[PDB]
């Protein structure tokens with residue numbers, strides 16, 4: 165803890181001015197948290213628990229949906245409809261990197277309507 | 284081979300009439316209390332010296348005229364970006 | 376979800392992720408959470424405050440954009456492999472993993488919905504981590520979306 169938020173600018177040019185932050189910025193010790201987690205050395209530890217959500221969840225699998233739905237409406241129509249459903253948010257999800265492939269929707273209909281596309 | 288004009292950007296002591304104690308007067312930016320990177324507003328040390336007390340003259344000790352702060356090898360590059368205030372000497 | 380419940384806070388206070396060093400190049404391997412990090416600037420324009428742009432989150436912490444927290448969102452999807460349990464060893468051949476996943480996704484599923492037997496017990500009662508695994512605390516610096 166070090167003083168209040170400060171802005172100091174004694175120069176005539178106001179484009180560039182000095183800023184003193186409220187808290188310290190020890191960028192030199194950038195490995196504090198990772199080494200602190202392994203309990204290599206003793207030190208302060210602060211843990212607080214906060215609740216955000218309640219009740220149970222439900223999860224559906226699209227692979228089983230493909231297998232089951234392809235039996236009674238063919239394969240082209242089901243694949244096309246599920247691709248359209250998977251590209252709801254305006255960006256494809258499969259193209260997204262695996263480590264960051266998370267996105268939500270606003271009231272979609274599942275399963276979608278399968279068109280009777282003739283071959 | 285192509286400059287028609289020569290400029291110098293150095294932090295060595297004795298340039299631009301800058302000493303190790305006049306910095307407060309030289310730079311308005313560090314006029315405020317330093318309370319900041321260690322390189323912010325931060326030498327000359329004796330004459331050239333050769334000291335060799337050992338009998339073998341093949342290897343002998345050398346004391347340079349100026350300091351050699353090889354530990355801080357990123358001073359100039361960080362100084363150019365104006366990350367922190369400090370001495371600046373330019374001559375044309 | 377059973378009912379909408381988005382992220383209430385404006386700034387994530389997590390220090391398990393190593394911060395970028397003094398050097399321009401990162402000595403440590405890249406961490407994803409740096410995409411939501413507020414950079415400290417030694418030179419600032421006139422009347423610059425975090426309340427104007429960066430909200431109430433204190434500088435040096437992580438700020439969460441507005442699109443990642445919506446009252447009106449109701450469904451989440453993810454086509455990822457990172458949630459799989461201990462029985463999805465990567466060193467094993469792709470054929471073995473495919474066969475095992477195909478075998479597992481038939482016993483566990485009824486219709487098209489997953490039985491509670493597979494989901495983690497934290498998500499719903501009666502879980503046993505048959506298909507998915509738990510979420511660790513170190514799994515926050517490379518997958519911020521999942522934890523958020």
Ligand SMILES: *[C@@H]1O[C@H](CO)[C@@H](O[C@@H]2O[C@H](CO)[C@@H](O[C@@H]3O[C@H](CO[C@H]4O[C@H](CO)[C@@H](O)[C@H](O)[C@@H]4O)[C@@H](O)[C@H](O[C@H]4O[C@H](CO)[C@@H](O)[C@H](O)[C@@H]4O)[C@@H]3O)[C@H](O)[C@H]2NC(C)=O)[C@H](O)[C@H]1NC(C)=O
Nearest residue numbers: 177179284285286287288289290291292371372373374375
């Ligand atoms: C080979 O040739 C090239 C081309 O000439 C050289 O590159 C030039 O190098 C010089 C030396 O650094 C540069 O000149 C510097 O410009 C700085 C910026 O000045 C701007 O500041 C105001 C306010 O922001 C702007 O509005 C305006 O556009 C100015 O251009 C100056 O800050 C430098 O010092 C000046 O200020 C100090 C006080 O802080 C005074 O003491 C100095 O005397 C000086 O007035 C400096 O002048 C220049 O920009 C470079 N480019 C060009 C195109 O000229 C190479 O360096 C050279 N190679 C060598 C010498 O090895």
Ligand SMILES: *[C@@H]1O[C@H](CO)[C@@H](O[C@@H]2O[C@H](CO)[C@@H](O)[C@H](O)[C@H]2NC(C)=O)[C@H](O)[C@H]1NC(C)=O
Nearest residue numbers: 461495496497498501502503504508509510511
């Ligand atoms: C995943 O989390 C669950 C609970 O969230 C863990 O189940 C607990 O396991 C310990 C011992 O391993 C028991 O003492 C608890 O009673 C269990 N909690 C229950 C039954 O609700 C489970 O061990 C975790 N698995 C891993 C691999 O971390």
Ligand SMILES: *[C@@H]1O[C@H](CO)[C@@H](O)[C@H](O)[C@H]1NC(C)=O
Nearest residue numbers: 247248251252253254255256
């Ligand atoms: C995904 O949807 C977007 C709508 O924003 C569209 O522009 C794009 O072409 C679609 N991609 C497909 C259908 O592969």
Ligand SMILES: *[C@@H]1O[C@H](CO)[C@@H](O)[C@H](O)[C@H]1NC(C)=O
Nearest residue numbers: 296297298299300301372374
């Ligand atoms: C210091 O200033 C004087 C006059 O102001 C000048 O003659 C002299 O060259 C300067 N010293 C240096 C190292 O530039």
Ligand SMILES: *[C@@H]1O[C@H](CO)[C@@H](O)[C@H](O)[C@H]1NC(C)=O
Nearest residue numbers: 270441442444445446447448
């Ligand atoms: C969220 O949904 C509500 C529903 O009425 C809507 O008014 C609002 O504009 C939506 N916000 C966004 C960002 O889509």
Ligand SMILES: *[C@@H]1O[C@H](CO)[C@@H](O)[C@H](O)[C@H]1NC(C)=O
Nearest residue numbers: 478479481482483484492505
């Ligand atoms: C499913 O797995 C359980 C144990 O996990 C096993 O007892 C059972 O025979 C398997 N098959 C069915 C159809 O339940």
